[PDB]
Design an enzyme around this catalytic site. Structure first.
Site, PDB file in Angstrom:
ATOM      1  N   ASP A   1      76.354  86.664   7.879  1.00 56.59           N
ATOM      2  CA  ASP A   1      77.656  86.126   7.429  1.00 56.59           C
ATOM      3  C   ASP A   1      77.512  85.588   6.006  1.00 56.59           C
ATOM      4  O   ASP A   1      77.934  84.487   5.718  1.00 56.59           O
ATOM      5  CB  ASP A   1      78.166  85.064   8.422  1.00 56.59           C
TER       6      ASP A   1
ATOM      7  N   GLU B   1      84.232  72.768  13.546  1.00 60.13           N
ATOM      8  CA  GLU B   1      84.767  71.798  12.580  1.00 60.13           C
ATOM      9  C   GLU B   1      83.624  70.921  12.085  1.00 60.13           C
ATOM     10  O   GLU B   1      82.786  70.484  12.879  1.00 60.13           O
ATOM     11  CB  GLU B   1      85.778  70.843  13.206  1.00 60.13           C
TER      12      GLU B   1
ATOM     13  N   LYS C   1      78.527  69.180  12.963  1.00 61.26           N
ATOM     14  CA  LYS C   1      79.227  70.407  13.156  1.00 61.26           C
ATOM     15  C   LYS C   1      79.456  70.547  14.654  1.00 61.26           C
ATOM     16  O   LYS C   1      78.541  70.841  15.418  1.00 61.26           O
ATOM     17  CB  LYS C   1      78.428  71.560  12.549  1.00 61.26           C
TER      18      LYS C   1
END
Ligand SMILES: C=Cc1cc(O)cc2nc(-c3ccc(O)c(F)c3)oc12
Length: 334
Positions: free
Chosen positions: A155, A51, A67
């Site tokens: 990613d 999050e 983070k």
């Protein structure tokens, strides 16, 4: 016998020539700071692994991003940290400012430089032709850099590209899945997000490389120029390959599988069928035609190949005619 081996065609041995501690992240010692140096302001976003919060460094009143990591192996946290430290100051790479733990919870958190606004997914369906080329060029700088430093992102997707449109600035974020490339290493194929997974991941070919990121990039480019988000819209990992096969064709797919002596999961037997390779014009319509050009299609075609070895490198991509105007406009300003 088993799968035919593969080696990256660029930056193959860069980790080997480095001191061991560059890539041997399990040995990295982390100095954990105190999260009470930071006050959380508001939630910015959420993910499978973290999050993200806007925060203030109370000692110098600067805005940062915090983070907070969801529970993963210590090994993986060390990996992300080492990679972030290795790439720090590189073009279009997010800057790690601090590493902390909450003194109560003991939950680990990474602290970054504040980057101004949008995730790429919010505007990338309303950019000009030129802006697609401009931001694509900026992404390639990040990928060429991190690949040259022996790292694959693994990613690449719109949520992981942060654009400040006001300042024409871009950062590649979320290095939590990134890994060091080593020739002959077999990697986990449960990486990337479903729509951006390369065929190598879908058919479980483990000896992949930097070229994985170039497929992901191709998926992004296609969604932007044809305004179809995502471009390859699978229902699951198996159907994802079917969707790719209906565009790229089955002939090149089965030649890929034969070339690397890949054993296809039996699930694929019935569902792949037989499909031609479609010309890109099939995806060109009235509303998207201003984003499509011969250069765009030529570039895209050279990113989206089954054979990871046949995809453009980041530097080859940057030298493509699609970017000639971007390149000349950049030498102008200096
Ligand atoms: C999500 C919204 C978001 C919004 C924003 O203005 C800046 C951000 N920076 C991050 C961020 C940075 C590094 C990471 O590794 C990461 F996962 C997230 O997410 C951000």
């Amino acid at each position: 016998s088993g799968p035919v081996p593969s080696r990256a065609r660029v930056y193959t041995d860069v980790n080997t020539h480095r001191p061991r501690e560059y890539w041997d992240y399990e040995s990295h010692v982390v100095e954990w700071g105190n999260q009470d140096d930071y006050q959380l302001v508001r939630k910015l976003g959420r993910g499978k692994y973290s999050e993200v919060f806007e925060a203030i460094n109370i000692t110098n009143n600067e805005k940062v991003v915090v983070k907070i990591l969801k529970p993963v192996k210590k090994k993986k946290i060390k990996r992300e940290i080492k990679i972030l430290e290795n790439l720090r100051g590189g073009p279009n790479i997010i800057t790690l400012a601090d590493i902390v733990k909450d003194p109560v919870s003991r939950t680990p958190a990474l602290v970054f430089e504040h980057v101004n606004n949008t995730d790429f997914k919010q505007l990338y369906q309303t950019l000009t032709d030129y802006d697609i080329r401009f931001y694509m060029y900026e992404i390639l700088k990040a990928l060429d850099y991190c690949h040259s430093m022996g790292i694959m992102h693994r990613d690449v997707k719109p949520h992981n590209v942060m654009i400040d449109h006001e300042h024409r600035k871009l950062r590649l974020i979320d290095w939590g899945l990134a890994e060091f490339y080593h020739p002959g290493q077999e990697y986990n194929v449960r990486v990337a997000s479903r729509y951006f997974k390369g065929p190598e991941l879908l058919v479980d070919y483990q000896m992949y490389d930097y070229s994985l990121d170039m497929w992901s990039l191709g998926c992004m480019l296609a969604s932007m120029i044809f305004r179809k988000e995502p471009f390859f819209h699978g229902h699951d990992n198996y159907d994802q390959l079917v969707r790719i096969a209906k565009v790229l064709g089955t002939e090149d797919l089965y030649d890929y599988i034969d070339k690397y002596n890949i054993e296809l999961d039996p699930r694929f037997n019935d569902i792949l069928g037989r499909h031609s390779r479609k010309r890109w014009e099939r995806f060109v319509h009235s509303e998207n035609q201003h984003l499509v050009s011969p250069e765009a299609l030529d570039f895209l075609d050279k990113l989206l190949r089954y054979d990871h070895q046949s995809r453009l490198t980041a530097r080859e991509a940057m030298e493509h005619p699609y970017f000639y105007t971007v390149v000349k406009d950049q030498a102008r300003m200096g």
